[PDB]
Amino acid sequence: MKTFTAKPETVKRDWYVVDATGKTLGRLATELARRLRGKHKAEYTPHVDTGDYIIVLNADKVAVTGNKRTDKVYYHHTGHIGGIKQATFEEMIARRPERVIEIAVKGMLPKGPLGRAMFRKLKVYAGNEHNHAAQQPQVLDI
Template sequence: MKTVSANKQTVSRKWYIVDAEDKTLGRMSTEIANRLRGKHKAEYTPHVDTGDYVVVVNAEKVKVTGNKFTDKTYYHHSGFPGGIKSITF
């Protein structure tokens, strides 16, 4: 049996619409990430973009567990001295 490697010509992409209302943030984001990378497909190839398109609706109504809504802080850095930024959920 020969190993098949995907390329740009053989990749077929689908559109997925995800309704985020009353879904848990972490579980939904892992499923979306797998769809974007194409890991749910049999022809997944790590060095080729085999992923699908994902549209998320009702993202403002997503559920978070625990105290993340009030206590979670996200940080990102610009790469320059003093460039750390933080936002809350």
């Protein structure tokens, strides 16, 4: 008896909408990554993307404990010798809040072609409105 393996052509994916207001960044991110990978489904398969589409609203209202709102620094290198550029949590929220949640979730997903595919199912919006009503998203409290 071979162990059951999910098939990408017959895998069911649902749509959920999550409100990030007042939610701890990391704790919220873990649940998103867990569901984006399909770890909550009994038919989870490591080599198949069995996760669900998730819409995140009010990304600019995410919360961080301690002094992380001004002390957490995001580093990235442009590739040139000058290179290193940094931005604090406050600046990222003011400049482009969606990247804060996207960056956090991206680090918790597996690395590789499948991990990138999982990240594609995450939709993050700074405001309280999304244009995915045609997908009939279901409210998810996490």
